[PDB]
Amino acid sequence: MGKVVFLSDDQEIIEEVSKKAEEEGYDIQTSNDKKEIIDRLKRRNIDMIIVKTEDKESISEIIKQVLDSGAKVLILSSDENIIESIRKQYPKVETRRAQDKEEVKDAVEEFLKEGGSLEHHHHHH
């Protein structure tokens, strides 16, 4: 039970991530409401999570709940300054710049192929 939960405030984002999950047959629970997700991380009942939004308020609080749970977290935002802030504050977070819903579902897929390992440069020489 690798509980994958996607979160996005926008419907058209959710549709494309669910569509990628349809094509590939990936297990995802998609949610629109951030307050629910904070409580699911309070129960630590999310194994790996993906949050797409520019709303820094949700991004920050969800990650702080994921630190408690020890889960995998993928932050997706249109703004690169948000992404980069989350990288320098949190080294263990998976982060990728996703402006269009194409980039979002791509990042979700890449995250799921490698079982929660998206963000990694040439770490092995």
What is the number of helices (H) and of strands (E) in the chain?
Answer: 5, 5
Sign of CA dihedral 114, 82, 32, 44: positive
Q: How was this structure determined?
A: NMR
Do residues 118 and 107 touch, judged by C-beta distance below 8 A?
yes
Structure tokens at 79: 């703004």
Look at the chain and count its residues.
Answer: 125
Of 2, 1, 33, nearest in space to 117 by CA = 2
Cα–Cα dist 33/29, whole Å: 12
Dihedral Cα 76, 78, 80, 82, nearest 10 deg: -60
For residue 20, the cross-strand partners are none
Cα–Cα dist 38/58, whole Å: 9
Cα–Cα dist 95/54, whole Å: 13
**SS3 state at 50:** strand
Instruction: Set out the domains of the chain in order of their start, with CATH numbers.
Output: 4-114 (3.40.50.11230)
How far from chain centre, in Å, is Cα 75?
Answer: 5
* Beta sheet of 29-31, edge-to-edge order: 29-31, 4-8, 48-52, 72-77, 94-97
Cα–Cα dist 109/118, whole Å: 9
**SS3 state at 36:** helix
Of 66, 78, 69, nearest in space to 103 by CA = 78
Rounded to a whole number of angstroms, the CA Rg of the chain reads 13
Q: How many CB atoms lie within 10 A of CB 106?
A: 17
Cα–Cα dist 47/42, whole Å: 12
